[PDB]
């Protein structure tokens, strides 16, 4: 029974997520906070949330809330999430998890000393189609994988008013490098062993695009390409000695294409429920099993990622 | 009426196809081939209607009838073989990998220049008519601003080449086909490569079986090159601009290309040919005729640079002395 969720903001993403909890298995949204109550209420009523707080401290002190979701702006994750973990309540922090590796680890540590769950929020790794790609790769399927690549391109970035600030959000890499690189490690069951790349960026700004070279734990190379400006499709391709899979919009896909060693390519089609519904369920389940961390979106994978992402922006905006 | 008389320094497997294209050109004609053993030369010399046969390379260089020598000898012998002919006062057309050492490639141009002789790396990709269309389309704004280009190349089996895993011999995936995509890509773009990094799959004391390159070009355009063995996927190259793109199948020997314009409709460009060698050859002839020592396309700069780039990777990987 149960599982009431508290929301730490009025982030435009809040509703879709709330819709998600509703489509979820055993979870309901209880409590929503702000710094400005009227702001919270307005959405608290727009949606069907029943409690309200003009402060995050409040949302925390409350006990009618079991776990909190922090979909706030980037440089405020750390403080926001630190105000919960220290206070006892479990956290579902968003991407970027952190814009600083150290900040990332601490977060996990104090979360542990408090014996309270802590996971980064990634819709992709829990989709029904993603689960099958991983299934197939392990069970023979494509022979061994030698190379994987990802292409992500947004036409405009004018709906992200802070796109060109390093300290705030970031660039193409901050924007969407974690998902693809986390995802691959997951479907392959291998850890990123190497990574170096290039990128486009004027000074005192962010990178409009970047192209990452990759190496995995098992003889499989990879390429990640995030871009702004192009109008090409976003698709991931897994290539094995015996097969291939192409995944369109891997973070919200319901379908994928598998090609065999013979020429035959088929379409896998697992249908659109809710896009958020899947990770929420996983999380709920993690909680039932009194677990501090997720076995998929593990601690090391989350830390490891911010580390890489930050060494890159370090590499660029500094020196 | 007169023609440039070509000399072939070896009895390479590629020789017959080269001779096929040579014969298809306007001003070329074959007149000599030489091997380190004589019948090894005459055997091929007789199947191909090639007059003259020499039993050594030295003889081929001494012959006053050969106006130029094509060297398709094994990788380790490019340097020594070219040095021989250029120092002997003959112009050379050398097969790639042009060399396995930057300084060696540099010296080769040093002697050619001191001998006032023509020298170029044999490279068919850059001369195809289809490639020209791509270059022009990009320069006239056909695709807008180029933000990303990529190239994938796969060879199911590499078991028709024994030395493939000898870093000393010919090399790995990057020695085998990395020079074409980087030179092809720089050439179509009008931009120079100014940054490159990558990862590769290799065992110790071995060459790479796979290879993934990340790179940067002047003017804000990024790229990725992927070369490998074992996969069965097609070999494609893609140029992505803000107003459209182009997909090139088997760029090194293709007669077609897939252009997609700003509006959104894609068309198939098409040209036909019997040999990938012809374009490369009569371009070479046109160079000899105009009396030049270097080619404006496959330049000294480009080649030397490409060699530096390829070897730098074998240095990181299988080395670090």
From TrEMBL, chain A:
Q: Does the keyword Oxidoreductase apply?
A: yes
Ranked from the top, the taxonomy reads: Bacteria, Bacillati, Bacillota, Bacilli, Lactobacillales
Which Gene3D superfamilies does the annotation name? Answer: Dihydrodipicolinate Reductase, domain 2, NAD(P)-binding Rossmann-like Domain
| Top-level lineage group | Bacteria
From the UniProt record, list the coiled-coil ranges: none
UniProt domain GFO/IDH/MocA-like oxidoreductase: residue ranges: 131-245
Write down the species: Enterococcus faecalis (strain ATCC 700802 / V583)
Task: Give one GO molecular function term.
Answer: oxidoreductase activity
Q: What is this protein called?
A: Oxidoreductase, Gfo/Idh/MocA family
Question: Entry's SUPFAM superfamilies?
Answer: Glyceraldehyde-3-phosphate dehydrogenase-like, C-terminal domain, NAD(P)-binding Rossmann-fold domains
Every copy of the Gfo/Idh/MocA-like oxidoreductase N-terminal domain together lies at 4-120
